[PDB]
């Protein structure tokens, strides 16, 4: 709800509940960090959901193609390694956050090269944000549908449980 | 926008500021590594490097050595551990001779200033010149670095052997 | 079959020939 | 060492030198002697030495093994 | 954008100088151009001159002299090459007496001149152990 | 100690230790200064 | 397919022609760089930016070539020395340490399943090399599933390594055809010249032609 | 980067690896060394000749000792047309069981002798592994003399 | 550094000086030829040994001769 | 032919020019030296001849080997 990147045509500066009208710059940076992290994690989660459903080469097959079921089938020592890798990545991100000129979601340090941003750079950042938002909605829907129905995405669609 | 620019505004260096050389991720990741982590004595840097290196060095020797075993064998683990320790010894010998022939300094970040201020009209290359201002760039610093590498390599190899035995036995 | 004494003293004499070799090597200078 | 001559190996060595000088975790280690390609005469000698050693070794192996394996 | 305003508008190449031209010696070539002509760097690719003072740094004297030879095609003649030691020890190199070496200037003495042809060289066997 | 243990005592000794010390000495010598 | 001399000759001839033509394309790229390349007309474009970081490209290609050669050929030599030492279980073989080309076998499986699943209007796979039945004409095999094992892994990586080294020689010739740290005015010597002299320790074969010469040698090796 | 080519100051000032390469290949070209006279040349050549003859005698002594210790000279005396002479034993940690079995000759893996030393020493009147040991001892003594 | 010698067969045609890539040779006054000039080698410390100087020499067996000698980072053409 | 290539690939122009010098001396002694002065092949042409002969010899050897083997069986 500022001159921040992420304002698109359907709803420009979409803050209907006024979360940003009262927040300071630090809280807004925190909000942008949370939104970008959620969007990236959700894009990965949606892609993994679908691909796992129609392709699970690892673990010598097995590891039932329905997600939320393979969640309880991974050896639980591979879960620990994924957890530790995510933790090390976020430790590195925390270290990045104290670098001078840091921008909320910018872990590549594009502020080093991008002074006086263009419209293409802002448009690409907005594209990433919008894809992340769509993936957040999609992954929430995926998890809820798999919980209530018990079938996965391409399985529920194939049968016709819509 | 352009994501490749001359390094530090010098178009004549043999280097570029790409999204890999000068990215915030690269900065933080290299600044958390033992070789560049702030607040570490050269002995501590050597100890951490040796620990990590012995830890991942025992792996290939134990797994693919001349005395492998598809099951767990104490002889295979001992062979891999001894090979890793001897390789660490060879690396420590290389470090020692490299430091012996490279530096002649016992306290850096000062001698450079002394010869930039109080003149250096001598045989040079010890008073003047002096490449690098790190504590690793001294005779004393590199000696402690090699000592730490060697001790940490032994400790890390032993720790990795213990972990391998535990994983092969209790899993 | 030669004995341990035969091989041992040959090794000792070989050592003496080695010290004579380094003396010649060092005398031919660095 | 005989067909490929110098000049082609000096530029490659320069590229390797740049790669070593511009990489982290390896900048801490630097050479005392500047790595350069072998000289023309040295390259000729090294190629001749390889040629001769390979020649001698392969023919010794052939003659000995053939005699042993053919005549019992 | 760049450290100095007189640098040519070069985007930087991974063919410039290395750690050698920080502790042994570096070479700087200076020249003044009437036009912001586009020229090829001796190290990498295309750079743009400044309509005025231009200063470039290189790792070798040959690189600076190749750049200067290229400058002659732009009708640029006032280029001058200097050698800089590890500290600011500047020494003028190429226009040593202000006149290019191809043009005869008074005040130059012959160096390495032998008052005979090649056939007058002494026999190597008479130059043994000296 | 039998005579047949001499190969196992000497071959590793020579063929590994002597290279190591010889490399150390030669590298130190050729990397010296004045 | 049952005329084996014809198949072998056609394959070998066409691969030889392809290798020669590729080396020629590299040669004429170098010729363009030496002769027809205008620095002013190519300010900050793709060609300029490639020349500006030629070092990085060539150094990383050098590292890749060393990695691939070390691995492929040294696995071959390790197999040879393990067999010579009477240690048959230490080889990089199928009955030993096995390097299964799983990615290629996955593709082979995908093609043999394509008719009716991904190519629903197909009646048979495109080639029986990917899998299927043995096709014989007059008791002579025309085509048959080509099984890929650890032997094909090693030879495929040998192919990759040789191709990478040929690319290294030719790309080093093209990129360093105009200038270098050795000869800053190599473009003034032309595309075809023997050297710049015995100086600089020796400047043999620095041309770009001398790179199409070495690349011809390495193309011969690879093909 | 200094002091290795002690005989050549021009090489010792080379900042490149060429100094090491040329230091090896010019070590025996005494006439081209720095601060060189003819007397020193002949004296150094003389001493090098002595060291060389010592090396030759040590090599012959080693052949004699290894035939006496790990060979089958005494067995070859009684049947020279069927027994294959053995040069020396083999101890290589890289051998598999198959290589050990194939190279196994009598008590240990060994190499057949293709130098013809068995026939030469038999012709000149050697019949015992103690005659070869005496020759090795004497040749090491001669090498010590020459050094 | 390499050694460069000039011989009185010099005709002062300047082709050696304008071919040197490292500014080693220069033209100096002389009275032994029509042109009244002779090549000189006052900066042999920059000599690289490329021998472009004597490739441009028109005299019968050369008037500039380059004798390769001790090597230096300048004479080896090392940018590193 | 492949082995012939190695003469051009391994050698250099100076030796062949100096040998042509003595051959030309013999021709001049017999008054049969050609007006077109015989010169050894240039360095680049020596390399080109070497690589052409190397390629021809190797490819022809593989050609004959492949054809004879696959026609016989
Ligand atoms: C939130 C992300 C996420 C999570 C938690 C999982 C979780 C899981 N996946 Mg999975 N997957 C994902 C994304 C994800 N996936 C994506 C995006 C793809 C498409 C390439 C896949 C493709 C995939 C396959 C093909 C298979 C799994 C399988 C599995 C299960 C076993 C773990 C495994 O082998 O992973 C394997 C994961 C991969 C091979 C790809 C992971 C690539 C990661 C997500 C991208 C890089 C991450 C990086 C380290 C961090 C980002 C850096 C920076 C942004 C900060 C487990 C339930 C296996 C299974 O049993 O299926 C039921 C299996 O066979 N996944
Ligand atoms: C640094 C190198 C490294 C090494 C040596 C290992 C080693 C291992 N990993 Mg592993 N892993 C790594 C990095 C590494 N990991 C990283 C960076 C990730 C991404 C987060 C993972 C994610 C991962 C998963 C998801 C799983 C493993 C598993 C395994 C084990 C089985 C591997 C195998 O082929 O069996 C020998 C083995 C202990 C598997 C395991 O432990 O199950 C038994 C498993 O399921 N790994
Ligand atoms: C991208 C947005 C999106 C789309 C296209 C769909 C599409 C669909 N949803 Mg849905 N859903 C979404 C997001 C979405 N959902 C989210 C974010 C949630 C969480 C609140 C849900 C929760 C949800 C439930 C609880 C149910 C569906 C159901 C359905 C199907 C009717 C249809 C396939 C129904 C279904 O398929 O089950 C019968 C159903 O019962 N959705
Ligand atoms: C030839 C390649 C190779 C091989 C065969 C191995 C083999 C192994 N590694 Mg290893 N590793 C390698 C390269 C290799 N590594 C490299 C290059 C790195 C650096 C990224 C590592 C980093 C690494 C870590 C960090 C760990 C291993 C571990 C292990 C062991 C896993 C099984 C177990 O009991 O632990 C389970 C196993 C012996 C694990 C281990 O030894 O645990 C005790 C472990 O924690 N590796
Ligand atoms: C030049 C002669 C010569 C040569 C080539 C060899 C070669 C060999 N000997 Mg040997 N040996 C020799 C003389 C020689 N011997 C003599 C004179 C003696 C009596 C002391 C021995 C006693 C001996 C024993 C007891 C054993 C060997 C063994 C071996 C084998 C492994 C190498 C080793 O452990 O060396 C060790 C050698 C010694 C301890 C003796 C020193 C060798 C001579 C005196 C030095 C010659 C130096 C030479 C002239 C130049 C040196 C170059 C140097 C500066 C780099 C190898 C086949 C081993 C074997 O059979 O394994 C299967 C073994 O156990 N040797
Ligand atoms: C005369 C020369 C020589 C000798 C005697 C050896 C000896 C050996 N090599 Mg070797 N090698 C050599 C030259 C030599 N190599 C060369 C030139 C090459 C390159 C072509 C190789 C390449 C090579 C490979 C690739 C491998 C060997 C291996 C081996 C070991 C045989 C396998 C086995 O059963 O041991 C089993 C080994 C052990 C049980 C542990 C041995 C570990 C070291 C050697 C013990 C040293 C103890 C030392 C005194 C410790 C110092 C104190 C320290 C704790 C601080 C053996 C130690 C194999 C091996 O074991 O790898 C380590 C192996 O994989 N070698
Ligand atoms: C059999 C002969 C032979 C061999 C082995 C090579 C090897 C190589 N050439 Mg080639 N070359 C040859 C003939 C050969 N060439 C001929 C005849 C020509 C004339 C046209 C050329 C022209 C040529 C050019 C123009 C180029 C090469 C390049 C390369 C390298 C590619 C990178 C690589 O694989 O390195 C890895 C090394 C090997 C595969 C060799 C074997 C190494 C073993 C298997 C592993 C390591 C062994 C181990 C270290 C031994 C230690 C023990 C020891 C100390 C006792 C490699 C060194 C390129 C280059 O510079 O490299 C990028 C390049 O640009 N070559
Ligand atoms: C490149 C070629 C190659 C390869 C891969 C191997 C591989 C092997 N050889 Mg071998 N060998 C080769 C060539 C090769 N050989 C040649 C040319 C010869 C003849 C001289 C031999 C002779 C030989 C002998 C005589 C023996 C072997 C043995 C072995 C095995 C154990 C070696 C060992 O201890 O590993 C040590 C490995 C390491 C210390 C680690 C190196 C590799 C690491 C993992 C690289 C990691 C890179 C990493 C991913 C970078 C990213 C990091 C990230 C954090 C950014 C292993 C399977 C032994 C055996 O019996 O095995 C069956 C044995 O006795 N070899
Ligand atoms: C005096 C001995 C001698 C010599 C010098 C030659 C010389 C030659 N023979 Mg040859 N030959 C000889 C004896 C000899 N032959 C005998 C006694 C026989 C038995 C009839 C043969 C049978 C024979 C055949 C059947 C073939 C040759 C070929 C060749 C040519 C190879 C040219 C080349 O550059 O190879 C370059 C070398 C290679 C490209 C690799 C050589 C093949 C190796 C062994 C395969 C290994 C590949 C493996 C996957 C790893 C490779 C890694 C690396 C290549 C990257 C060359 C003219 C071949 C030819 O035309 O060219 C190859 C050929 O087809 N010869
Ligand atoms: C022999 C040789 C010469 C001398 C070679 C000469 C002078 C070539 C002479 C060719 C004759 C005069 C014509 C060709 C005669 C052939 C019989 C014709 C070819 C055969 C047909 C079937 C094509 C070089 O000049 C040379 C230069 C650089 C490196 C190596 C070498 C080199 O090895
Ligand atoms: S060696 Fe280098 S310089 Fe001398 S001739 Fe052959 S190529 Fe030209
Ligand atoms: S070598 Fe010939 S050309 Fe190159 S600098 Fe010395 S003199 Fe001038």
Taking the C-alpha atoms of residue G180 and residue G134, their distance in angstroms, rounded to an integer, is 56
With CB atoms and an 8 Å threshold, state whether B66 touches G90: yes
Q: What angle do CA G56, G62, G68 make, to 5 degrees?
A: 135
How many Å separate Cα B5 from the centre of its chain?
Answer: 30
Kind plus residue range of the DSSP H or E element containing J18: helix J13-29
Hey, is E27 helix, strand or coil? strand
What phi and psi, each to the nearest 5 degrees, are found at residue E28? -120, 135
Taking the C-alpha atoms of residue I61 and residue E116, their distance in angstroms, rounded to an integer, is 12
What would the two tokens of residue G64 be? 């890749």
DSSP string, A41-93: HHHHHHHHHHHHHH---TTTS-S-SSTTTGGGTS-SSHHHHHHHHHHHHHHHH
Q: Which residues face I67 on adjacent strands?
A: I3
What would the two tokens of residue D56 be? 């001698």
DSSP string, G160-208: HHHHHHHHHHHHHHHHTTS--SS-TTGGGG-SS-SBS-S-TT--BT-SS
In residues, how long is chain C?
30
Q: Taking Cα atoms as reference points, which of B100, B18, B30, B99 lies closest to residue D25? A: B30
Taking the C-alpha atoms of residue A132 and residue A36, their distance in angstroms, rounded to an integer, is 7
Taking the C-alpha atoms of residue G60 and residue D15, their distance in angstroms, rounded to an integer, is 9
**Ligand 10: which of J3, J4, J11 to mutate, judged by most atoms within 8 Å of the beta carbon?**
J11
Pairing between strand H108-112 and H86-89?
antiparallel
* Facing B13 at nearest CB: one of E11, E16, E23: E16
The position carrying tokens 């691995």 is G71
Q: With b meaning 16 or more CB within 10 Å and e meaning fewer, what string describes I42-75?
A: bbbebbbbbbbbbebbebeebbbbbebebbbbbb
Q: Taking Cα atoms as reference points, which of A2, H18, E112, G87 lies closest to residue B65? A: G87
Hey, is E79 helix, strand or coil? coil
I19 Cα nearest atom in ligand 12: 3
A 10 A CB-CB count for E64 gives 29
Q: Compute the Cα dihedral for B120, B123, B129, B134 and give only its sign.
A: negative
Which residues in chain F are closer than 8 Å to H108, comparing Cβ atoms?
4, 7
Identify the chains in contact with J, defined as 3+ C-beta pairs within 8 A: D, G
What phi and psi, each to the nearest 5 degrees, are found at residue I65? -125, 130
Taking the C-alpha atoms of residue G83 and residue G74, their distance in angstroms, rounded to an integer, is 14
Does residue G223 contact residue G15 with C-beta atoms inside 8 Å?
yes
Does residue B88 contact residue B50 with C-beta atoms inside 8 Å?
yes
**Ligand 1: which of A52, A54, A65 to mutate, judged by most atoms within 8 Å of the beta carbon?**
A52
What is the Cα gyration radius of chain G? 23
The answer to whether J16 is a known ligand-binding residue is yes
Q: Taking Cα atoms as reference points, which of B150, B156, B157, B104 lies closest to residue B130? A: B104
Taking the C-alpha atoms of residue H147 and residue I3, their distance in angstroms, rounded to an integer, is 43
What phi and psi, each to the nearest 5 degrees, are found at residue B5? -140, 160
Chain breaks in chain H (C to N over 2.5 A) after: none
Taking the C-alpha atoms of residue G143 and residue G136, their distance in angstroms, rounded to an integer, is 7
Three-state secondary structure readout of D9-72: HHHHHHHHHHHHHCCCCCCCCCCCCECCCCCHHHHHHHHHHHHHHHHHHHHHHHHHHHHHHHCC
Three-state secondary structure readout of chain B: CCCCEEHHHCCCECCEECCCCCCHHHHHHHHCCCCCCCCCCHHHHHHHHHHHHHHHHHHHHHHHCCCCCCCCCHHHHHHHHHHHHHHHHHHHHHHHHHHHHHCCCCCCCCHHHHHHHCCCCCCCCCCCCCCCCCHHHCHHHHHHHHHHHHHHHHHHHHHHHHHHHHHHHHC
What would the two tokens of residue D13 be? 């060595």
First to last CA, chain I: 18
Hey, is A14 helix, strand or coil? coil
H93 Cα nearest atom in ligand 6: 31
What phi and psi, each to the nearest 5 degrees, are found at residue B127? -70, -65
Taking the C-alpha atoms of residue G203 and residue G176, their distance in angstroms, rounded to an integer, is 13
Q: What angle do CA J62, G70, G205 make, to 5 degrees?
A: 65
Resolution (Å units): 2.9
For the Cβ of J42 lying below 6 angstroms from any atom of ligand 10, the answer is no
Q: Taking Cα atoms as reference points, which of C27, C26, B95, H6 lies closest to residue F34? A: H6
The position carrying tokens 């990433």 is A128
Taking the C-alpha atoms of residue G95 and residue G150, their distance in angstroms, rounded to an integer, is 10
Which residues in chain B are closer than 8 Å to G97, comparing Cβ atoms?
64
Pairing between strand E113-114 and I3-7?
parallel
Taking the C-alpha atoms of residue B93 and residue B95, their distance in angstroms, rounded to an integer, is 5
What would the two tokens of residue D68 be? 């042993």
- Residues whose CB is less than 8 angstroms from the CB of residue I31 and which lie 6 or more positions away in sequence, other chains included: none
The position carrying tokens 């940490």 is B152
Taking the C-alpha atoms of residue G162 and residue G173, their distance in angstroms, rounded to an integer, is 17
Hey, is A26 helix, strand or coil? helix
What phi and psi, each to the nearest 5 degrees, are found at residue B128? -80, -170
Residue C30 burial class via C-beta count within 10 angstroms: exposed 0-12, middle 13-18, buried 19 and up = exposed
* Facing B12 at nearest CB: one of E1, E23, E56: E56
Does residue I37 contact residue I30 with C-beta atoms inside 8 Å?
yes
First to last CA, chain A: 36
Alpha helices, DSSP H only, in chain E? 20-23, 61-72
For the Cβ of G98 lying below 6 angstroms from any atom of ligand 8, the answer is no
What would the two tokens of residue F24 be? 């150390």
Taking the C-alpha atoms of residue A152 and residue I10, their distance in angstroms, rounded to an integer, is 92
Taking the C-alpha atoms of residue E13 and residue E20, their distance in angstroms, rounded to an integer, is 17
H42 vs F: CB within 8 A = no
- Residues whose CB is less than 8 angstroms from the CB of residue G156 and which lie 6 or more positions away in sequence, other chains included: G101, G104
The CA distance from B100 to the nearest CA of chain F, in Å, is: 8
Pairing between strand H104-105 and B5-6?
unpaired
Taking the C-alpha atoms of residue G134 and residue J47, their distance in angstroms, rounded to an integer, is 49
With CB atoms and an 8 Å threshold, state whether C17 touches H136: no
D7 Cα nearest atom in ligand 11: 2
Q: Compute the Cα dihedral for H68, H69, H74, H77 and give only its sign.
A: negative
The answer to whether G65 is a known ligand-binding residue is no
First to last CA, chain D: 40
Taking the C-alpha atoms of residue I25 and residue I47, their distance in angstroms, rounded to an integer, is 9
Smallest CA separation from ligand 12 atom 7, residue: I53
E116 vs I: CB within 8 A = yes
Three-state secondary structure readout of chain J: CHHHHHHHHHCCHHHHHHHHHHHHHHHHHCCCCCCCCCCCCCHHHHHHHHHHHHHHHHHHHHHHHHHHHHHHC
Does residue H67 contact residue H87 with C-beta atoms inside 8 Å?
yes
Q: Which residues face E82 on adjacent strands?
A: E28, E92
User: I49: phi > 0 → left, psi -120 to 50 → alpha, else beta; which?
Assistant: left
Q: Taking Cα atoms as reference points, which of J20, I48, E10 lies closest to residue B16? A: E10
- Residues whose CB is less than 8 angstroms from the CB of residue A96 and which lie 6 or more positions away in sequence, other chains included: A102, A107, A109, B24, B25, B27, B28
Does residue H121 contact residue H132 with C-beta atoms inside 8 Å?
yes
- Residues whose CB is less than 8 angstroms from the CB of residue G180 and which lie 6 or more positions away in sequence, other chains included: D11, D14, G186, G206
Q: Taking Cα atoms as reference points, which of H74, H86, H76 lies closest to residue H111? A: H86
Pairing between strand H104-105 and H108-112?
antiparallel
What is the Cα gyration radius of chain I? 13
What would the two tokens of residue A89 be? 């990545």
What phi and psi, each to the nearest 5 degrees, are found at residue E17? -75, 165
Taking the C-alpha atoms of residue E56 and residue E32, their distance in angstroms, rounded to an integer, is 12
In residues, how long is chain D?
72
- Residues whose CB is less than 8 angstroms from the CB of residue I10 and which lie 6 or more positions away in sequence, other chains included: I30, I32, I33, I38, I39, I59, I63, I64
């Amino acid at each position: 709800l500022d001159g921040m990147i992420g304002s698109s045509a359907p709803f420009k500066n979409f803050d209907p509940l006024g979360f940003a009208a009262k927040a300071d710059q630090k809280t807004l940076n925190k909000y942008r960090e949370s939104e970008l992290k959620h969007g990236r994690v959700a894009m990965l989660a949606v892609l993994g959901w679908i691909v796992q459903e129609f392709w699970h080469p690892l673990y010598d097959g097995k590891l039932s193609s329905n997600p939320l079921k393979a969640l309880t089938e991974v050896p639980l020592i591979g879960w620990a390694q994924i957890f530790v890798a995510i933790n090390v990545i976020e430790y590195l991100q925390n270290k990045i956050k104290e670098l001078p000129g840091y921008r909320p979601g910018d872990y590549l340090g594009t502020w080093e090269w991008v002074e006086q941003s263009d419209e293409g750079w802002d448009s690409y950042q907005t594209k990433e944000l919008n894809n992340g938002r769509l993936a957040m909605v999609a992954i929430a829907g995926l998890i809820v549908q798999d919980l209530i129905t018990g079938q996965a995405a391409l399985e529920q669609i194939t049968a016709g449980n819509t | 926008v352009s994501f490749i620019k001359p390094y530090r505004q010098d178009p004549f260096v043999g280097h570029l500021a790409t999204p890999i050389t000068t990215s915030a991720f690269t900065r933080a990741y290299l600044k958390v590594l033992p070789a560049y982590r702030p607040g570490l004595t050269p002995l501590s840097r050597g100890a951490e490097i040796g620990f990590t290196h012995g830890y991942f060095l025992i792996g290939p020797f134990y797994t693919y050595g001349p005395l492998r075993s598809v099951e767990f064998s104490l002889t295979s683990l001992a062979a891999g551990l001894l090979a890793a320790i001897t390789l660490l010894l060879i690396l420590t010998v290389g470090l020692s001779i490299y430091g012996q022939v490279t530096y002649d300094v016992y306290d850096n970040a000062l001698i450079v200033k002394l010869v930039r201020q109080m003149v250096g009209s001598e045989r040079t290359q010890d008073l003047p010149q002096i490449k690098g201002t790190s504590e690793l760039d001294t005779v004393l610093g590199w000696q402690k670095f090699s000592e730490g590498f060697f001790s940490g390599g032994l400790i890390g190899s032993i720790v990795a052997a213990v972990g391998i035995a535990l994983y092969s036995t209790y899993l | 079959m030669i004995y341990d004494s035969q091989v041992y003293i040959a090794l000792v004499i070989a050592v003496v020939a080695s010290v004579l070799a380094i003396r010649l090597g060092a005398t031919l200078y660095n | 060492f005989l067909i490929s001559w110098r000049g082609y190996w000096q530029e490659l060595i320069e590229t390797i030198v740049w790669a070593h000088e511009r990489t982290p975790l390896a900048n801490l280690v630097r050479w005392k002697d500047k790595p350069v390609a072998l000289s023309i005469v040295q390259a000729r000698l090294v190629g001749l030495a390889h040629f001769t050693i390979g020649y001698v070794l392969t023919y010794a192996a052939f003659v000995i093994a053939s005699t042993i394996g053919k005549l019992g | 954008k760049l450290k100095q305003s007189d640098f040519p508008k070069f985007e930087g190449s991974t063919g410039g100088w290395l750690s050698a031209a920080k502790n042994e010696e570096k070479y700087v070539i200076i020249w003044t151009s009437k036009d912001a002509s586009l020229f090829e760097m001796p190290t990498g690719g295309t750079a743009k001159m400044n309509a005025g003072n231009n200063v470039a740094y290189f790792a070798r004297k040959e690189q600076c002299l190749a750049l200067g030879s290229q400058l002659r095609g732009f009708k640029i003649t006032n280029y001058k090459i200097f050698r800089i030691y590890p500290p600011l020890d500047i020494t003028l190199l190429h226009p040593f007496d202000g006149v290019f070496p191809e043009k005869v200037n008074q005040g130059r003495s012959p160096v390495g001149k032998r008052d005979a042809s090649i056939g007058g060289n002494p026999n190597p066997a008479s130059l043994k152990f000296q | 100690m039998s005579l047949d243990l001499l190969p196992s005592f000497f071959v590793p000794l020579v063929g590994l230790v002597l290279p190591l010390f010889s490399i150390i000495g030669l590298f130190l010598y050729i990397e010296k200064e004045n | 397919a049952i005329d084996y001399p014809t198949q072998l000759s056609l394959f070998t001839h066409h691969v030889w022609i392809g290798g020669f033509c590729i080396v020629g394309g590299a040669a004429h790229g170098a010729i363009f760089f030496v002769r027809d390349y205008n620095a002013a007309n190519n300010y900050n474009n793709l060609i300029d930016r490639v020349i500006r970081h030629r070092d990085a490209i060539i150094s990383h290609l050098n590292w890749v070539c060393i990695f691939l050669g070390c691995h492929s050929f040294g696995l071959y030599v390790h197999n040879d020395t393990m067999r010579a030492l009477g240690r048959s279980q230490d080889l990089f073989s199928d009955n030993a340490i096995a390097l299964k080309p799983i990615f290629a076998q996955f593709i082979q499986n995908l093609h043999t399943l394509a008719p009716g699943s991904t190519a629903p209007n197909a009646l048979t796979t495109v080639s029986y090399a990917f899998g299927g039945d043995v096709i014989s004409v007059g008791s002579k095999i025309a085509m048959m599933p080509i099984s890929l094992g650890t032997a094909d892994f090693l030879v495929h990586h040998i192919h990759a390594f040789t191709i990478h080294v040929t690319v290294l020689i030719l790309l080093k010739g093209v990129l360093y055809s105009r200038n270098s740290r050795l000869i800053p005015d190599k473009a003034n010597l032309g595309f075809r010249f023997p050297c710049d002299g015995p100086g600089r320790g020796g400047t043999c074969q620095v041309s770009a032609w001398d790179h199409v010469f070495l690349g011809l040698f390495w193309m011969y090796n690879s093909i | 980067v200094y002091k290795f080519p002690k005989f050549s100051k021009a090489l010792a000032e080379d900042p490149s690896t060429r100094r090491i390469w040329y230091g090896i290949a010019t070590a025996h070209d005494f006439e081209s060394h720095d601060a060189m006279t003819e007397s020193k040349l002949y004296q150094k050549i003389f001493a090098s000749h002595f060291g060389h003859i010592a090396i030759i005698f040590l090599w012959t002594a080693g052949n004699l000792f290894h035939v006496a210790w790990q060979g089958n000279f005494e067995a070859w005396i009684l049947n020279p047309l069927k027994v294959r002479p053995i040069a020396h034993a083999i101890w290589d940690p890289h051998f598999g069981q198959a290589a050990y079995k194939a190279f196994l000759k009598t008590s240990s893996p060994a190499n057949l002798a293709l130098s013809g030393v068995y026939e030469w020493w038999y012709t000149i009147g050697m019949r015992t592994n103690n005659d070869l040991y005496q020759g090795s001892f004497f040749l090491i003594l001669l090498s010590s003399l020459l050094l | 550094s390499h050694t460069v010698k000039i011989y009185d067969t010099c005709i002062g045609c300047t082709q050696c000086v304008r071919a040197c890539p490292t500014d080693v040779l220069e033209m100096v006054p002389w009275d032994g030829c029509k042109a009244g000039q002779i090549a000189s080698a006052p900066r042999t410390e920059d000599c690289v040994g490329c021998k472009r100087c004597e490739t441009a020499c028109p005299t019968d067996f050369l008037s500039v001769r380059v004798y390769l000698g001790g090597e230096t980072t300048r004479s080896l053409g090392l940018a590193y | 032919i492949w082995a012939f290539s190695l003469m051009f690939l391994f050698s250099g122009r100076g030796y062949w020019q100096e040998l042509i010098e003595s051959i030309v001396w013999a021709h001049n002694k017999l008054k049969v030296a050609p007006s077109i002065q015989p010169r050894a092949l240039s360095i680049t042409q020596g390399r080109a001849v070497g690589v052409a002969h190397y390629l021809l010899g190797g490819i022809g050897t593989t050609w004959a080997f492949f054809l004879a083997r696959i026609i016989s069986v």
